Enzyme design. Structure first.
Site, PDB file in Angstrom:
ATOM      1  N   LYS A 282      -5.408   4.578  -1.807  1.00 30.56           N
ATOM      2  CA  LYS A 282      -3.877   4.165  -2.885  1.00 30.56           C
ATOM      3  C   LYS A 282      -3.906   2.774  -3.526  1.00 30.56           C
ATOM      4  O   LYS A 282      -2.858   3.144  -4.851  1.00 30.56           O
ATOM      5  CB  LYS A 282      -3.016   3.985  -1.290  1.00 30.56           C
TER       6      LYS A 282
ATOM      7  N   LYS B 199     -10.280  -5.889   3.045  1.00 30.41           N
ATOM      8  CA  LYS B 199      -9.126  -6.362   2.008  1.00 30.41           C
ATOM      9  C   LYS B 199      -9.077  -7.577   1.813  1.00 30.41           C
ATOM     10  O   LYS B 199      -8.451  -8.103   0.669  1.00 30.41           O
ATOM     11  CB  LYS B 199      -7.598  -6.303   3.094  1.00 30.41           C
TER      12      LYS B 199
ATOM     13  N   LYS C 254     -13.628   6.593   0.538  1.00 30.60           N
ATOM     14  CA  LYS C 254     -12.428   7.311   0.942  1.00 30.60           C
ATOM     15  C   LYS C 254     -11.016   6.937  -0.023  1.00 30.60           C
ATOM     16  O   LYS C 254     -11.330   6.857  -1.177  1.00 30.60           O
ATOM     17  CB  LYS C 254     -11.747   5.846   2.119  1.00 30.60           C
TER      18      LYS C 254
HETATM   19  N1  LIG Z   1      -8.018   8.992   2.668  1.00 28.62           N
HETATM   20  C1  LIG Z   1      -7.043   9.575   3.769  1.00 28.62           C
HETATM   21  N2  LIG Z   1      -7.386  10.582   4.279  1.00 28.62           N
HETATM   22  C2  LIG Z   1      -6.521  10.634   5.951  1.00 28.62           C
HETATM   23  N3  LIG Z   1      -5.460  10.006   6.204  1.00 28.62           N
HETATM   24  C3  LIG Z   1      -5.697   8.897   5.550  1.00 28.62           C
HETATM   25  C4  LIG Z   1      -5.788   8.829   3.775  1.00 28.62           C
HETATM   26  N4  LIG Z   1      -5.656   6.860   3.941  1.00 28.62           N
HETATM   27  C5  LIG Z   1      -5.027   6.910   4.575  1.00 28.62           C
HETATM   28  N5  LIG Z   1      -4.914   7.345   5.583  1.00 28.62           N
HETATM   29  C6  LIG Z   1      -3.649   7.434   6.840  1.00 28.62           C
HETATM   30  O1  LIG Z   1      -2.441   7.873   5.998  1.00 28.62           O
HETATM   31  C7  LIG Z   1      -1.536   6.714   7.079  1.00 28.62           C
HETATM   32  C8  LIG Z   1      -0.854   5.790   6.678  1.00 28.62           C
HETATM   33  O2  LIG Z   1      -1.732   4.801   6.071  1.00 28.62           O
HETATM   34  P1  LIG Z   1      -1.566   3.432   5.185  1.00 28.62           P
HETATM   35  O3  LIG Z   1      -2.532   3.066   4.835  1.00 28.62           O
HETATM   36  O4  LIG Z   1       0.093   3.010   5.362  1.00 28.62           O
HETATM   37  O5  LIG Z   1      -1.568   3.339   7.144  1.00 28.62           O
HETATM   38  C9  LIG Z   1      -1.660   2.353   7.315  1.00 28.62           C
HETATM   39  O6  LIG Z   1      -1.618   0.997   6.156  1.00 28.62           O
HETATM   40  C10 LIG Z   1      -1.465   1.581   9.037  1.00 28.62           C
HETATM   41  N6  LIG Z   1      -1.715  -0.181   8.969  1.00 28.62           N
HETATM   42  C11 LIG Z   1      -0.078   1.263   8.553  1.00 28.62           C
HETATM   43  C12 LIG Z   1       0.612   1.351  10.476  1.00 28.62           C
HETATM   44  C13 LIG Z   1       1.292   0.215  10.258  1.00 28.62           C
HETATM   45  N7  LIG Z   1       1.807   0.197  12.165  1.00 28.62           N
HETATM   46  C14 LIG Z   1       1.149   0.946  12.099  1.00 28.62           C
HETATM   47  C15 LIG Z   1       1.266   1.704  14.007  1.00 28.62           C
HETATM   48  C16 LIG Z   1       0.855   2.927  14.596  1.00 28.62           C
HETATM   49  C17 LIG Z   1       0.148   3.532  12.880  1.00 28.62           C
HETATM   50  C18 LIG Z   1       0.363   2.786  11.897  1.00 28.62           C
HETATM   51  C19 LIG Z   1       0.135   1.960  11.586  1.00 28.62           C
HETATM   52  C20 LIG Z   1      -2.663   6.202   7.818  1.00 28.62           C
HETATM   53  O7  LIG Z   1      -2.482   7.058   9.539  1.00 28.62           O
HETATM   54  C21 LIG Z   1      -3.478   6.817   7.569  1.00 28.62           C
HETATM   55  O8  LIG Z   1      -5.211   6.752   8.528  1.00 28.62           O
END
Ligand SMILES: Nc1ncnc2c1ncn2[C@@H]1O[C@H](COP(=O)(O)OC(=O)[C@@H](N)Cc2c[nH]c3ccccc23)[C@@H](O)[C@H]1O
Ligand SMILES: Nc1ncnc2c1ncn2[C@@H]1O[C@H](COP(=O)(O)OC(=O)[C@@H](N)Cc2c[nH]c3ccccc23)[C@@H](O)[C@H]1O
Ligand SMILES: [N+]
Ligand SMILES: [N+]
Lengths: 326, 326
Positions: free
Chosen positions: B195, B111, B192
């Site tokens: 978003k 990032k 990957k």
């Molecule tokens: N291409 C993909 N294939 C499979 N799984 C994927 C894919 N892209 C995204 N994910 C999963 O989606 C969830 C949310 O994604 P974020 O980018 O908001 O995910 C994030 O930005 C975290 N930092 C948010 C967060 C903040 N606090 C937390 C505490 C516990 C767990 C998660 C969080 C996640 O489970 C992520 O692994």
């Protein structure tokens, strides 16, 4: 009426440099401004703290603030951790400050010097200090010279936030004493007097007894001139003693130079030690009274109540501005 | 019963990779665990966010969580900024994490890559994520593979806190799907699905219409084998499509390979597009209903109430352990 904010970290040592640069101003200004005086416990943990000592140091600092004359009817005294807004605001500001900006802080470079794994709170100290100040719509921040840079970053952050999200913050301004903005070590007067100096003769704590004050002032490094005249560069030791004497006695540096015309350092030091004793004795007596009183907690309870009302509202406005929440 | 915590950042794009790696697990596990599902708005602001869009993205994500089937009687759904404990806990953890540790996070390196003035929240993202998890005495954290490192840092922080201050935290464990833990871009299946991909054909959003899904699946990069068989290395495109197909349909990769024995990519893609449409249509319909309802806010109000009760108590324990406050 304008607003003042200032904070002090709870620690094992509170010096006469803290008193001269900061606490003396707080008492001076408290009747003319809305005042928020804080015990910055969350800043204290930017370095490891023994938990029991921290809890005690927090009570001790509250007692010292009250002992020096901060009046709960004139000012709001409170513990930083007791007002969640500071942590919330610190996060928002950490999101707008640049890593480069934090890395250039002298306080950070000095506290992290020769370090091996610097804990992150050391680096993110400033945004939390900026939050402390900005939360209260602060106009003036009375401090010693060593906080100038942090207040400059705070001004930069407030301006940055205001430009990006809409005018919300007052741009605060430091208020630094003309004399005594930077009281120096008695052991090496080219260095600032520090709460963490390994040499206890470098500083005088607000709890030092008479015999101890006398020893410290007497041992204070001077020069071989035998002339009591101000000259920071040439005579750093005597100059620093003159600042302490001037600030605590209310006599100008000029008055003291005239008074000591033709006299030696011995009488000057003996008399200065007495001025320090005369200053600290009544403070110490009031300090013990607060330490033994349930009123100390009542005062802090009331201060957090007021601080929470004001800070929580500013946090709502900040979130509204950035579009957090609903 | 054990506890689950997971969060998703509110953003302009929520993908089928978010759905397959995360949301699908949330719905699966919600009846068997105490669950806290969060809209991580404070993490969203680690990069600039247009305030009006952020406010909307927060409501949209709440609607999507509910649309996919998260049940407010089974789980607590809430907005991160609405529970001050997360910011308070994040500060305490930032004080025990090392700068080196934050700098090694891949998420941070990616990032911040080619960046010129990195905003500090990007660097301090992890401690806030660790706070999110640890606050609830979490046992399991269901995520996609990309969150593994952050959860490893969270485990390290919890252990560090427990060693220094007394056992307080449960050491949480990630739960990553066997199939679909890392859904890849349809445009370049060695990357990957993200978003924030500048190429909208790389991802399928949960709000994509049928014609749009069809276009994206059809254009999905494959190979010149004409054989529908799983092989991540050799056939990344077809393998990724098989994962999407398997996860959404409930058919094993083996079942699909048999079913498509002797068939070409054309029919396979047409059928997969239909499976994606069949999945997203009911979600979209429920999503619009939530977006137009006052009940969406009621659900979030109730979730923050519950989250605040639990998190605020953990914050008290954390402060008691470090000796903050009184
Ligand atoms: N291409 C993909 N294939 C499979 N799984 C994927 C894919 N892209 C995204 N994910 C999963 O989606 C969830 C949310 O994604 P974020 O980018 O908001 O995910 C994030 O930005 C975290 N930092 C948010 C967060 C903040 N606090 C937390 C505490 C516990 C767990 C998660 C969080 C996640 O489970 C992520 O692994
Ligand atoms: N030798 C000296 N001569 C003159 N003044 C001195 C001397 N040593 C210390 N001071 C002043 O004492 C106050 C408290 O010092 P701290 O180190 O706790 O000061 C600190 O550690 C701040 N980061 C605490 C803080 C946190 N948030 C704030 C918001 C506004 C103002 C201050 C704060 C300060 O006014 C400091 O300038
Ligand atoms: N006042
Ligand atoms: N549940």
């Amino acid at each position: 009426m304008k607003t003042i904010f200032s904070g002090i970290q709870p620690s094992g040592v509170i010096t006469i440099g803290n008193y001269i640069g900061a606490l003396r101003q707080f008492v001076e200004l408290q009747h003319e401004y809305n005042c928020y005086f804080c015990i910055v416990d969350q800043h204290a943990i930017t370095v490891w703290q023994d938990p029991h000592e921290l809890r005690q140091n927090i009570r001790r600092l509250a007692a010292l603030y009250l002992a020096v004359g901060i009046d709960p009817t004139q000012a709001t005294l409170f513990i930083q951790s007791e007002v969640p807004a500071h942590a919330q605001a610190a996060w928002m500001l950490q999101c707008i400050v640049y890593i480069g900006e934090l890395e250039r802080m002298t306080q950070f470079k000095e506290k992290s010097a020769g370090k091996e794994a610097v804990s992150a709170g050391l680096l993110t100290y400033p945004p939390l200090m900026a939050a402390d100040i900005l939360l209260y719509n602060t106009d003036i921040v009375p401090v010693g010279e060593d906080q100038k840079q942090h207040i400059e970053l705070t001004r930069d952050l407030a301006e940055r936030f205001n430009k990006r999200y809409g005018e919300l913050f007052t741009i605060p301004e430091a208020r630094i004493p003309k004399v005594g903005a930077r009281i120096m070590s008695l052991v090496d007067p080219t260095k600032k007097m520090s709460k963490s100096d390994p040499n206890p003769k470098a500083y005088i704590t607000l709890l030092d007894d008479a015999k101890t004050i006398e020893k410290k002032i007497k041992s204070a490094v001077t020069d071989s001139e035998g002339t009591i005249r101000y000259d920071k560069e040439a005579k750093p030791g005597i100059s620093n003693l003159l600042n302490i004497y001037s600030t605590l006695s209310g006599q100008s540096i000029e008055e003291l130079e005239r008074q000591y015309e033709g006299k030696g350092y011995g009488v000057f030091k003996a008399d200065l030690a007495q001025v320090v004793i005369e200053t600290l004795r009544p403070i110490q007596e009031r300090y013990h009274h607060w330490m033994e009183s349930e009123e100390l907690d009542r005062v802090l309870d009331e201060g957090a109540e007021k601080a929470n009302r004001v800070a929580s509202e500013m946090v709502r406005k900040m979130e509204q501005a950035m579009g957090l929440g609903r």
